Design a protein around this ligand. Structure first.
Ligand SMILES: [Mg+2]
Ligand SMILES: [Mg+2]
Ligand SMILES: [Mg+2]
Lengths: 235, 212, 240, 244, 233, 222, 204, 195, 231
């Protein structure tokens, strides 16, 4: 057939480019970074009403100061999360401190290109890694299967990514509050989601310096959705 | 060294001395013999200091990875067994460890596991480990009751280390107290044995043999 | 060793070997899982093309992983045995180290992890198997039902079906299963499970297998006559 | 490099089938028919040797029926050489079990072991599968008399009566027609030979074209005897049943 | 773990104002047997370094080959191999010191005590010690084995600290070394009269002196010494 | 039999001030009854405002310091030139030491510097990696001669306030960098008089927020 | 300490006219402590008999091993193994553990089914074959057995006479050994019949 | 650990095991249960070197439980004892052998018979009517040899066991802090809470 | 065409297409400029962003106190090669107490990249590197290609539109080589050189990345408001 680690005539790795197509088919995940915290939100996208939606875990804790949202072939993310958690805990063991969000992201991205004929293919999943450290403050990273990671003020990945990113382009400014960011994720998720947004088919989370990483309750998220509807109907 | 830990109505009391010796030479009087594994779990130090420090710090890392994966507090049983299984792999290599893994969970209640570098793992209500263990056991056995108050239990642990600190040449310096509750451990301060001895002698009327 | 990358991405972003593994599941006999208020029931189809079979010794479709958890499946039978073995070993390994039996979610997460591993390892093909894992966590009376598939994704279900004509029985369950009030008793849960299989099975003779799992390691497999009584009662009520 | 020449033996078809397993089953369909019938007081194994010659030394020959231990035997359908590799592995597993537990290996455990080995070749290794289907006839003190079959996929199932090899469709219908649960060994012997006599591609069924065996409790008191029939004994039972 | 077989005794050395001097006798002992009298234990590396080695001779020959191999390797793809990127004494020492410590850590030591004497690119004197344990140290005077006990005291009377180095000339330094070699010949039972001496000067370069002998010895007083106490005749 | 260990003598002393820290050590290096060097630096600046010494067997001491310096360098590469805090360095050194648990670095390690709040810090290690933050710690040959003196003159142990007669302790007043250096110099002068392996020279490294400063003093050479 | 004399016990084998005999005591102990009076040391694989003295765990292990190997032999060869062939198998199997051996003293006994020839053999712990015509001895009272056998034995004894000779050789040897006794068993082996007799002896 | 006894009577197997756990100088525990249930009708008591004893017992337990699930069938006591012996026989020629002696008391549901197996750390298996490990037999066997009958009831077996324990408590220098007694019969495993 | 399926296959004209495709990835990468005098060596790199919310991809990596590089192409491959350089620089320092020669650093990179072109299964590196350093023979500038070819130069540029900067340096050769003992003026020439490779976009504060090494100057990277001086 053809090599797994083959370059195309344009100078790109076929398998990496194809894994990016798989991520486009994945459910939408949005991250917004502010000076009061970083917010992570996801579309759950249950394939049937009999599927208990609370068992859909697309937002995940890496450490107390680092959270993670995923999009694409979510089964592939489990080993990436395991590595990340191990890296975060191992660094704390060696250095008696929290690990930098960038260093954690770099550790995850080192796995990405370890494929050939090591694992048999790249990961089919993109990660939004959000966190906080004392050196660089609140940070949001986008970790791809290419091994590249970009820092973002705000970022959307998944099926409604290009539409959501254009919306994040206009809406984001440097003086956003945490509450403003929460509603903004819910607003953009509702726009790109096929089904109607509610507390059962969408999930919110955040990371603050004081309280650390927290996944939001369905009751808490429900109030933010109700607050969103009223403020949109307000004008 | 003298370290103890016992279960009671109000949870667990952990008490240790602070002396470190190399032969007759007193290397330190300010050694920490309670490892704060995490906010809910405590571990005592006896035998090899490095072996206890290193592997119980390591245990804390494993406990953290457990509750990240399982989204649930690790049991005292599971935590203690991670340590005992680890040291058992090294059996014969020369590790020196005698520790109490102490914790308070919903499903178990207050639990103490004695763990050994021989691979021994014992659940129990009262444990004393170290060169001054026999002295501490005497005070504990004669005064222990399940229905002790948190105040009295803390004193009993303090008084038992003092008993050993006095008689055992390789124990002393100061007494460190901890109280383990379901919501986590609470530190109850460092108590210099020199000052504590005279205080206890006068107030309690004990140690009449000693001139003060 | 053989290191060939069999599971790989295609231009449209699909992993055909994982998708073709699902087609093997589609071919497999139907399996259904329904959880009540204080029980879970695992229904399984036995194709009647194979008669002159010895039902005593023939591998049963539902398998005990531990005394409190069970695993049924649809797809390649030989592949299922490898997952069942690994799960049973991990169940004992968990008891040995954690001094507590596995939760149903943990056992599911493990099996799903094995299935995932085979989708990006060299020289191996994915399992042509989807599983339904059911049981009760230790010292817990809340019913658990999970599903896994060749890709390695897993999730919890109030009720679910897999295998051939699973589209039809899922259609049935989606209209007949009420979340606000699930099957309160064992009878109601088993009845709804048999009813759902009767949409697809053909004959209600030896083609339906039912296994009931209750809290505190209380697992029992229904016999032919016991199931036949449900089949009789369902069709008699239907004649109206 | 080498990738160019790789057949990729362990992959799925778009329909979700294992190419090599399916083609191995096609291979087995051209092999001599083997039949197993389970009765209340014993098991019968009957099998047809493929287009033999008059100069073949039959009495020392063995291509169909093999012995795994004193309690368990197998009928082979497919590549004889492949079967012998698996048979020796099975013989070893039985002995390992006996050494460990000091008890004869239960039939199903042995069958599962061999079937798991076959499965491995379909999922990993990049090698071709074993082109072999077995019929396992055996006895243990848990389930008593048991018949199983395994095929190159590694899937195994239990049976009251079963055929493998050539003309299994025709053979299985004939068995399904005349089999009953209260049947006995002497009746099962007659059914097996009658089934082969009708399904055979040869002009007539003779002793030189057959291998035959029985697992009976018909041994002195509570114990089991395997009987691999000799050429003269197969000739006698053919006359007794009235086929020749 | 081994035991040394054929051995070399003291290596002695010192710093002076413009460079370093190093010396070692030409003997390869076999226990108490003075087996080999033509053994060169000072091995020059380039025109700026001299490595003096004591202890096991078979390990010395191995080290000698490592250094010869090091020069070859340094010349590979190196247009400045005889200029800016030539081997320094500090490079040669650090390499040996790494090897010595690695070997002791594998419980299979090179059974030697080594002194690397040389002059760096900037004209700085280099003099450092390393042994079978991987222990390293530097000093205005360095000596191995018996030299440590008898040579150092004499050499330290010339250069007692760092500030005495610029005050010490090559003639004074060489005189002290030659005298120390005589003292070692009097008192070390595993030494020989024949020795080699090497001077590495920042101006005049490497001067290697072979076939030197201990001379101006005092023995005449031995005739008067009689008995072990009371004996007169 | 080959013995991979040796004793190179020497004595070191770490003292933690209020907003400073000192790590001192004699410059004499010995084997048995012979002097190898009268000036062989033993306390080292390892970067990131950390000073270190690994006293005992000099080869293991040099190996450990070298490996730690290397760890500081790679900490910068891997973590965006982040400053290695004294507590993080201490934990890192534990893992270096315990890594050779069954063939130990035969040294008593001490590091000194400032914690993340700017206060003086000294950490003390045993050969196999057990460690602790301490206010005062002498290490090596004359450690038993120095520590009792420090207990008395730094922590004011057994000293009470005149008139009260054993009822009121002498108050633990903070010592200045000039006051600490006096106690360090007198400790080493006393150790030199009564311990044969101590002498020649004393080298002190002083750590403050401004950086690392060195001070050298002569000791008796007999 | 010495593995070959922890558990104790003995085996003896003799040839007669168209017959062989093999016999053993029944004691298993932990040095001074008697543990079992039913520990038989003679096993058989088809018509070939194997006695094994020495460390009891190895006696058990080797019995299980030769059962294993003779069963596979029979399946492949389509015939029961012979004493001459089995002797070589025992030797090969012991020598493959040359530098970590089973602490045993095996004794083969049997009649060749084709030739009808009586056969006995002995081995050291490491596999060296002792193929004697007259008799083979093994165990903690081997010296005593050598003394008994050397005087009591005469060639070409009939089965019922051979029984008396081997029985008296065993019994009186075991009574002079602290670690042997506690009952005894004697096998009288002919070409197509084998009689097994338990002997009455002192139980101290 | 110190003393472990076993006695097979008419219709059951009784295992008695000491409660003491000593760490050189001090007795750390006086209520230690030196036994593990391998299967519903098979109990294994154990004594030997610290750590090894429990590690071995639990390893065996896990393996028998694994077999029980896989086959949906309980192994006979004979089969379990053979498996255990092989593990110990494998262990003795290892880098670091398990220093563990065991008694396996089980009730065979097929044969309707109680069975007691004694296995030492070398892999020395023996089926017995009554057994012990270490020095325990030296004090008790003379009493068991005298009084034992194969048709004893469970109550009579316990009385003979009390006599053995009394003789141990009299003549042994070590204080083993009494024994925990367990009975294995057709109905399963149960503990005699008063002894 | 038929000879580009893997790196182990020569074409009929003697070409290695997989290596040439890896070379193509460098041309797609963002521009970076390298130049030196007799005292100092300078790297100037135009960092690329994904969009307005995103950060600007870092281009320059430090290998030792006296050496470092700028990348153009696959960033993960640069991380692998830079890590390897860090180890080799570090091996030289630890074992020989010797700073690794820049020329020898190039020889090591060549040999590492070469092994990936001759063996089956692997792939060439998809990145180009510009290594600057100051060693015992003064200032140095290297150009690494993943074919294995390493070239010592006075100045150069790699990446998209790099020809414009490369032509500028070819004209300015006689001027910038003489900029001795003046780091600011040498950087200016580098910033003016990279400006020739710009279209539409211009050099902003978070866009530009500059690094320098010299006689009494350790390898230091300048980003953010530190490079506002040179805009
Ligand atoms: Mg563990
Ligand atoms: Mg002196
Ligand atoms: Mg006796």
């Amino acid at each position: 057939d053809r090599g797994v680690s083959t370059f195309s005539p344009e100078g790109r790795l076929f398998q990496v480019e194809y894994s990016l197509e798989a991520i486009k088919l994945g459910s939408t995940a949005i991250g917004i970074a502010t000076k009061e915290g970083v917010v992570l939100g996801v579309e759950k996208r249950a394939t049937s009403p009999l599927l208990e939606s609370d068992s859909i875990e697309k937002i995940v804790e890496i450490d107390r100061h680092i959270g993670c949202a995923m999009s694409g072939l979510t089964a592939d993310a489990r080993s990436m999360i395991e590595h990340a958690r191990t890296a975060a805990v191992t660094h704390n063991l060696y250095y008696d401190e929290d690990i930098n969000v960038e260093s954690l992201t770099q550790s995850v991205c080192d796995l990405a290109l370890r494929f050939g004929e090591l694992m048999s293919r790249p990961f089919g999943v993109a990660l939004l890694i959000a966190g906080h450290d004392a050196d660089d403050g609140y940070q949001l990273f986008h970790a791809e299967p290419s091994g590249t990671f970009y820092r973002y003020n705000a970022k959307a990945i998944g099926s409604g990514s290009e539409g959501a990113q254009a919306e994040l382009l206009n809406e984001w400014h440097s003086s956003l509050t945490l509450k403003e960011a929460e509603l903004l994720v819910l607003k953009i998720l509702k726009q790109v989601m096929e089904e109607k947004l509610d507390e059962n088919n969408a999930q919110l989370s955040c990371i603050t310096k004081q309280d650390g990483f927290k996944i939001y309750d369905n009751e808490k998220t429900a109030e933010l959705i109700k607050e969103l509807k009223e403020k949109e109907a307000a004008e | 060294t003298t370290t103890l830990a016992f279960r009671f109505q109000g949870g667990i009391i952990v008490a240790v001395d602070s002396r470190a010796t190399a032969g007759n030479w007193v290397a330190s009087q300010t050694v920490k013999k309670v490892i704060e594994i995490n906010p809910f779990l405590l571990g005592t130090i006896a035998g090899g200091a490095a072996d206890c420090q290193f592997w119980e710090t390591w245990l804390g890392s494993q406990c953290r990875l457990h509750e990240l994966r399982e989204k649930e507090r690790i049991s005292v049983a599971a935590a203690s067994k991670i340590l005992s299984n680890l040291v058992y792999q090294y059996k014969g290599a020369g590790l020196s460890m005698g520790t109490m893994i102490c914790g308070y969970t919903r499903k178990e209640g207050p639990t103490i596991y004695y763990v050994d570098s021989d691979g021994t793992r014992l659940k129990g209500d009262i444990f004393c480990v170290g060169s001054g263990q026999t002295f501490a056991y005497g005070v504990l056995d004669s005064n222990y009751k399940w229905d002790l108050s948190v105040e009295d239990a803390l004193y009993l642990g303090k008084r038992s280390i003092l008993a050993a600190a006095h008689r055992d040449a390789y124990s002393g310096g100061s007494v460190n107290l901890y109280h383990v509750t379901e919501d986590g451990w609470i530190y109850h301060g460092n108590h210099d044995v020199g000052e504590l001895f005279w205080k206890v002698k006068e107030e309690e009327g004990s140690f009449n043999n000693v001139i003060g | 060793g053989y290191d060939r990358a069999l599971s790989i991405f295609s231009p449209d972003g699909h992993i055909f070997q994982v998708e073709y593994a699902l087609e093997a599941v589609k071919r497999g006999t139907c399996a259904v899982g329904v959880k009540g208020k204080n029980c879970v029931v695992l229904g399984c189809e036995r194709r009647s093309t194979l008669k002159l079979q010895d039902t005593r010794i023939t591998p049963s479709k539902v398998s005990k992983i531990d005394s409190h958890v069970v695993l049924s499946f649809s797809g390649l039978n030989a592949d299922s045995r490898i997952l069942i073995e690994k799960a049973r070993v991990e169940a004992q390994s968990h008891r040995l180290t954690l001094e507590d039996p596995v939760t149903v979610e943990y056992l599911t997460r493990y099996v799903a992890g094995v299935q995932q591993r085979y989708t990006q390892s060299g020289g191996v093909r994915p399992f042509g198997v989807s599983t339904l894992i059911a049981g009760f966590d230790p010292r817990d009376d809340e019913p658990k039902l999970y599903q896994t598939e060749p890709s390695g994704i897993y999730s919890s279900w109030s009720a679910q079906t897999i295998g051939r004509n699973s589209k039809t029985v899922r259609e049935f369950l989606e209209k007949n299963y009420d979340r606000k009030e699930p099957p309160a008793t064992v009878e109601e849960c088993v009845k709804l499970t048999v009813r759902s299989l009767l949409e697809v099975v053909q004959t209600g003779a030896k083609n339906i297998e039912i296994t009931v799992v209750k809290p505190d390691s209380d697992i029992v497999a229904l016999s032919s006559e016991e199931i036949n009584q449900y089949v009789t009662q369902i069709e008699q009520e239907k004649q109206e | 490099g080498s990738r160019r020449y790789d057949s990729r033996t362990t992959i799925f078809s778009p329909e979700g089938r294992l190419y090599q397993v399916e083609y191995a089953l096609e291979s087995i369909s051209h092999a001599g028919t083997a039949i197993g019938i389970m009765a209340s007081d014993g098991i019968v194994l009957a099998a047809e040797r493929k287009v033999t010659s008059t100069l073949l030394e039959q009495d020392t020959s063995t291509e169909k029926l093999y012995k795994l231990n004193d309690k368990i035997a197998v009928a082979v359908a497919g590549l004889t050489a492949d079967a012998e590799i698996l048979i020796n592995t099975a013989r070893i597993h039985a002995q390992n079990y006996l050494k460990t537990y000091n008890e004869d290996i239960p039939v199903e455990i042995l069958v599962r072991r061999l079937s798991d080995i076959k499965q491995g070749y379909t999922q990993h290794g990049g090698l071709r599968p074993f082109g072999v289907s077995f019929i396992y006839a055996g006895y243990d003190d848990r389930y008593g008399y048991q018949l199983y079959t395994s095929n190159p996929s590694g899937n195994y199932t239990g049976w009251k009566a079963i055929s493998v090899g050539a003309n299994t469709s025709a053979a299985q219908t004939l068995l399904q027609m005349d089999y009953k649960d209260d049947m006995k060994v002497d009746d099962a012997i007659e059914l097996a030979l009658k089934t082969l006599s009708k399904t055979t591609d040869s002009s007539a069924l003779t002793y030189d074209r057959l291998e035959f065996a029985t697992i009976r409790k018909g041994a002195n008191d509570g114990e089991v005897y395997q009987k691999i029939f000799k050429p003269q004994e197969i000739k006698d039972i053919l006359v007794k049943t009235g086929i020749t | 773990t081994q035991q040394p077989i054929v051995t070399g005794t003291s290596v002695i050395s010192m710093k002076y104002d413009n460079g370093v001097i190093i010396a070692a006798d030409n003997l390869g002992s076999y226990g108490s047997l003075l087996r080999f009298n033509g053994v060169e234990r000072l091995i020059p590396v380039g025109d700026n370094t001299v490595v003096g080695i004591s202890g096991d001779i078979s390990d010395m020959q191995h080290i000698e080959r490592l250094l010869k191999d090091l020069v070859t390797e340094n010349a590979y793809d190196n247009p400045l191999a005889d200029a800016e990127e030539a081997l320094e004494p500090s490079y040669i020492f650090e390499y040996l010191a790494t090897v010595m410590y690695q070997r002791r850590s594998k419980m299979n030591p090179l059974w030697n005590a080594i002194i690397v004497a040389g002059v760096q690119s900037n004209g700085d004197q280099f003099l450092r010690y390393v042994n079978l344990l991987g222990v390293t140290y530097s000093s205005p005077t360095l000596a191995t084995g018996f030299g440590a006990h008898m040579a150092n005291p004499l050499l330290r009377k010339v250069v007692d600290r760092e500030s005495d180095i610029p005050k010490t000339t090559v003639q004074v330094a060489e005189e002290a070394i030659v005298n120390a070699m005589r003292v070692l010949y009097y008192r070390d039972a595993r030494s020989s009269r024949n020795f080699s001496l090497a001077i590495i000067d920042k101006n005049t370069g490497l001067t290697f002196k072979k076939n030197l002998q201990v001379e101006n010895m005092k023995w005449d007083f031995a005739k008067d010494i009689k008995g072990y106490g009371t004996q007169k005749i | 039999q080959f013995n991979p260990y040796g004793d190179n003598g020497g004595t070191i002393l770490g003292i933690a001030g209020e907003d400073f820290a000192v790590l001192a050590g004699d410059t004499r290096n010995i084997t048995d009854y012979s002097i190898n060097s009268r000036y062989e630096p033993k306390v080292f600046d390892c970067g990131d405002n950390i000073v270190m010494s690994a006293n005992g067997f000099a080869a293991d001491g040099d190996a450990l310091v070298k490996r730690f310096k290397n760890s500081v360098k790679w900490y910068h590469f891997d973590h965006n030139d982040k400053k290695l805090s004294i507590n993080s360095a201490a934990r890192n050194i534990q893992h270096l030491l315990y890594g050779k648990r069954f063939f130990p670095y035969y040294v008593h390690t001490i590091i000194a510097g400032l914690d993340e709040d700017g206060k003086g810090a000294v950490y003390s290690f045993d050969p196999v990696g057990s460690y602790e933050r301490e206010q005062c710690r002498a290490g090596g040959a004359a450690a038993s001669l120095i520590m009792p003196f420090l207990d008395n003159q730094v922590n004011f142990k057994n000293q009470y306030e005149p008139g009260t007669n054993g009822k009121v302790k002498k108050p633990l007043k903070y010592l200045s960098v000039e006051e600490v250096i006096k106690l360090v110099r007198d400790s080493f002068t006393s150790a030199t008089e009564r311990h044969i392996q101590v002498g020649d020279g004393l080298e002190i490294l002083i750590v403050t927020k401004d950086g690392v400063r060195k001070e050298f003093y002569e000791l008796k050479r007999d | 300490s010495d593995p070959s004399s922890i558990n104790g016990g003995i085996v003896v084998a003799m040839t007669g006219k168209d017959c062989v005999a093999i016999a053993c005591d029944l004691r298993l102990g932990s040095q001074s402590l008697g543990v079992s009076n039913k520990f038989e040391k003679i096993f058989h694989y088809g018509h070939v008999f194997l006695g094994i003295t020495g460390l009891a765990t190895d006696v058990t292990t080797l019995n299980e091993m030769f059962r294993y190997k003779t069963n596979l032999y029979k399946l492949k060869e389509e015939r029961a193994i012979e004493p001459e062939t089995f002797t070589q198998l025992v030797s090969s199997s012991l020598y493959e553990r040359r530098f970590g051996p089973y602490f045993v003293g095996p004794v083969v006994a049997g009649i060749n089914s084709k030739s009808g020839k009586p056969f006995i053999a002995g081995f050291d712990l490491i596999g060296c074959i002792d193929e004697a015509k007259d008799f083979i001895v093994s165990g903690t009272a081997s010296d005593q057995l050598f003394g008994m056998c050397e005087s009591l034995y005469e060639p070409n004894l009939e089965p019922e006479d051979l029984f008396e000779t081997i029985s008296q050789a065993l019994l009186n040897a075991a009574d002079r050994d602290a670690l042997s006794g506690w009952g005894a068993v004697v096998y009288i082996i002919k070409k197509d019949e084998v009689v097994k007799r338990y002997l009455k002896m002192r139980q101290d | 650990m110190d003393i472990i006894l076993g006695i097979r009577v008419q219709d059951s197997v009784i295992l008695a095991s000491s409660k003491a756990v000593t760490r050189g100088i001090s007795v750390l525990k006086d209520s230690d249960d030196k036994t593990r249930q391998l299967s519903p009708h098979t109990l294994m008591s154990f004594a030997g070197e610290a750590g090894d004893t429990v590690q071995f017992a639990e390893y065996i337990q896990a393996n028998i439980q694994l077999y029980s699930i896989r086959e949906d069938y309980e192994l006979s006591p004979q089969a379990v004892s053979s498996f255990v012996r092989q593990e110990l026989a494998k262990s003795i020629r290892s880098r670091r052998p398990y220093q563990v002696n065991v008694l396996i008391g089980g009730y065979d549901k097929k044969k309707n018979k109680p069975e007691l197996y004694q296995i030492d750390y070398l892999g020395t298996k023996v089926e017995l009517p009554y057994g012990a490990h270490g020095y325990s037999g030296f004090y008790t066997f003379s009493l068991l040899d005298h009084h034992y009958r194969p048709d004893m009831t469970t109550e009579e077996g316990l009385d003979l066991l009390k006599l053995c324990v009394q003789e141990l408590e009299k003549r042994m220098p070590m204080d083993f802090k009494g024994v925990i007694v367990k009975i294995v019969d057709k109905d399963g495993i149960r503990q005699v809470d008063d002894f | 065409n038929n000879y580009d399926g893997d790196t182990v296959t020569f074409s009929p004209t003697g070409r290695l297409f997989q290596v040439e495709y890896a070379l193509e990835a460098i041309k797609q990468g963002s521009v970076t400029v390298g130049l030196r005098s007799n005292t100092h060596a300078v790297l100037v790199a135009l960092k690329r962003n994904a969009d307005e919310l995103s950060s600007y991809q870092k281009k320059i990596i430090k290998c030792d106190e006296h050496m470092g590089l700028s990348l153009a192409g696959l960033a993960p491959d640069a991380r692998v090669l830079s890590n390897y350089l860090r180890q080799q620089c570090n091996y030289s320092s630890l074992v020989f107490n010797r700073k690794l020669a820049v020329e020898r650093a190039g020889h090591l990179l060549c040999d590492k990249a070469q092994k990936n072109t001759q063996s089956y299964g692997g792939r060439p590196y998809g990145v180009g590197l510009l290594i600057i350093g100051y060693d015992k023979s003064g200032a140095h500038l290297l150009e690494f290609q993943p074919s294995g070819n390493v070239t010592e130069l006075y100045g150069t540029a790699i990446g998209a539109r790099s020809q414009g900067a490369k032509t500028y340096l070819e004209r300015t050769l006689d001027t910038f080589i003489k900029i001795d003992g003046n780091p600011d003026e040498l950087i200016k020439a580098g910033v003016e050189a990279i400006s020739q490779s710009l279209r539409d976009e211009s050099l902003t504060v978070d866009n530009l990345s500059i690094a320098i090494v010299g006689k009494d100057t350790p390898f230091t990277i300048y980003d953010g408001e530190a490079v506002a001086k040179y805009i």
